[PDB]
């Protein structure tokens, strides 16, 4: 004698700025009654959409994104960065036998003071003419690849918030400066950022947040 759907207030999800479709999807709440309202209650949920489902082209089939809801207005709720994950399949595929895996991470701030820890993975590659059947690095190789990745990733951040960092990551500029520095040490294939998580946001700043909008 209820059926919450005869009572669910409804809603649609809007995305930020540095992508393609600002429109994402729909949601449900509960009519903003006196004592417990649809506003302040939830909103502050999160949503994971593959950015190939967000940027259009599938050269992006992996690479998932975490968007969070901060502010809301009349059947319209905006969203801002909250993370970026890979996919299980790609990773589980990238990790082949017969080759060295190399991972490394760092914790670092931005201008607009969000704190994050981004990750990075690479794999030693066979060189085209290789006779031996595996290709492994010399540890000393691996420590030096990590140190560069590290030297690189710490530079890439503290540039104009995730804002720019977001704009930085999407076309994977980082990926190739890695590839750049690296090739002086060792072959290496794939080479991605793979993960980045958020752990200490600044303060709301209704002004600044509203900058990705229009």
């Amino acid at each position: 004698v209820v059926d919450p759907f005869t009572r669910k207030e409804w809603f649609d999800i809007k995305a930020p700025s540095t992508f393609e479709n600002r429109n994402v999807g729909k949601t449900l709440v509960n009519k903003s009654t006196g004592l417990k309202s649809a506003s302040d209650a939830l909103k502050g949920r999160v949503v994971e959409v593959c950015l190939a489902d967000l940027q259009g082209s599938e050269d992006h089939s992996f690479r998932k994104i975490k968007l969070r809801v901060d502010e809301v207005q009349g059947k319209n709720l905006l969203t801002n960065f909250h993370g970026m994950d890979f996919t299980t399949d790609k990773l589980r595929s990238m990790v082949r036998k017969w080759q060295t895996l190399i991972e490394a991470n760092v914790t670092v701030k931005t201008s607009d003071d969000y704190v994050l820890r981004i990750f990075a993975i690479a794999f030693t590659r066979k060189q085209a003419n290789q006779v031996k059947r595996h290709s492994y690095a010399q540890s000393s190789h691996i420590r030096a690849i990590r140190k560069v990745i590290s030297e690189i990733l710490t530079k890439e951040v503290q540039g104009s918030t995730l804002a720019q960092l977001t704009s930085k990551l999407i076309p994977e500029v980082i990926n190739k400066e890695i590839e750049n520095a690296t090739k002086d040490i060792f072959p290496l294939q794939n080479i991605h950022v793979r993960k980045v998580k958020l752990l200490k946001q600044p303060k709301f700043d209704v002004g600044a947040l509203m900058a990705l909008h229009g």
Binding site: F5, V24, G25, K26, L42, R45, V49, D53, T87
Partner: protein, 127 residues
């Protein structure tokens, strides 16, 4: 084109779950389990069941609003079997075959940088 949500099909042995939610997760929409749609414990996970539950589940999905939905299929995981149950397939199968849309579906099985000792002790389950 559609209105979107998330599928999330947990298929272990002994039972298979299906339940669509708001693409944010916080808000449900219709569940129903393999156990629900037949009665004999032993059969609580069979594809023949997971179908009839994915039947009920699709119905409420298109009866409330969701026109489409991405799936995140999943085994027990942790320190357990890690491999998909029987009724993951049938469910998926019989829920796209219900006239709902499919789009970009990954496997969200939890997998650990191993440990917390598995159960059943160093000598295995001997029976």
């Amino acid at each position: 084109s559609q209105v979107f949500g998330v599928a999330r099909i947990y298929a272990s042995f002994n039972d298979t779950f299906v339940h669509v939610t708001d693409l944010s997760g916080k808000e449900t929409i219709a569940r129903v389990t393999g156990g629900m749609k037949v009665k004999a414990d032993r059969d609580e996970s069979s594809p023949y069941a997971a179908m009839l539950a994915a039947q009920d589940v699709a119905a409420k999905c298109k009866e409330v609003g969701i026109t489409a939905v991405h799936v995140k299929i999943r085994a027990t995981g942790g320190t357990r079997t890690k491999t998909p149950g029987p009724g993951g397939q049938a469910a998926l199968r019989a829920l796209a075959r219900s006239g709902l849309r499919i789009g970009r579906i990954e496997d969200v099985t939890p997998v650990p940088s191993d440990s917390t000792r598995k159960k059943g002790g160093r000598r295995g389950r001997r029976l």
